[PDB]
Ligand binder design. Structure first.
Ligand code: HG
Ligand code: HG
Lengths: 111, 111, 111, 111
């Protein structure tokens, strides 16, 4: 009965000190995890920001590809209208030349 | 005087032939130049037609050069508009990279 | 003295429970923090890869752009060469006109 | 008698001056005809020369045109290469965007 009291007293003090030690590991572990979660949350913010920028980046490359398309069509068509004009000049020149052939036929008959 | 008759009649006959043959040489000529005049008139009409055609040729060349300047502008402008969209994407890319380094800085501290 | 042993035993049982639940909490928190840090370390190497890819691959666009500008500059040069030739064709033709004006007045003079 | 001798003389003198008047009409016709044929021959030679010049010069414009077409096509090849590279960039950066979405999910899950 007294033996038992003694040893209950001894186990009581052991377990109180164990509880105190663990409450302290838990407080360290906590402070730790709050700090980690701080950066996780920062990482989430910054990540979603970067994902929206990448999405804008894809949209912008698409727009550049549309403008490239337009450039290609603008140069070809502009150069095509020019050609129809030069072809009209070349055609007039071929006529000038046939008329010179007829003048030549005229002059070469002379004596 | 009789010696003189057979002589002057003999010599007026020679002149009559000379006249006859000069009238034929003049007629060769009068006919050759009649044709040449005709060719000359025709040459004048054809040279006038050819200068009018040459005038139309210069108007076409002049328009063709106008249209080529047109095509220069349309090519340069449309490609400049592409470049402005391309530069915009490239700027977006530069900014992504800057955000990723901001994020790398955040995470290098993790341990 | 019996009551005293009962009181202490019940104290000692509540302390032993508190000890198990503290150790259980510490473990489960250790394990969760551990899993968070792995995530962030993985996010670090991934960020470094993404930044290096965007650097490499933007270079490929500026390089195609370099090749575009070169081709475009050659197109302008050729356009401008062609404009010079057209200016010169115009001037030559002007001189041909004057010379045909000269033939006409000659034709008009000998007719 | 002597009356006839005078008579034949009036005819003789009348014929020498006919021969004179004819010889001079012939001379003026040759001055004239030479002037005409001279102009026609020179025109024939000038006409052939003008035809050569027009032909050489239209062939320069046509060569300049080929050269411009040559630079144009290299520009379109450049631009088509660049379209392929933008299409490749659109796909790559949509891949990266997906990676970031997957990372965001993982960061959420680990809280
Ligand atoms: Hg957040
Ligand atoms: Hg890495």
């Amino acid at each position: 009965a007294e033996q038992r009291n003694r040893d209950l007293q001894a186990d009581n003090q052991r377990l109180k000190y164990e509880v105190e030690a663990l409450k302290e590991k838990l407080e360290h572990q906590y402070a730790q995890s709050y700090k980690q979660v701080s950066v996780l949350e920062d990482d989430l913010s910054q990540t979603r920001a970067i994902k929206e920028q990448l999405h804008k980046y894809v949209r912008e490359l698409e727009q550049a590809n549309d403008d490239l398309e337009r450039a290609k069509r603008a140069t070809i068509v502009s150069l095509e209208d020019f050609e129809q004009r030069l072809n009209q000049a070349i055609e007039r020149n071929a006529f000038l030349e046939s008329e010179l052939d007829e003048k030549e036929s005229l002059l070469v008959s002379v004596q």
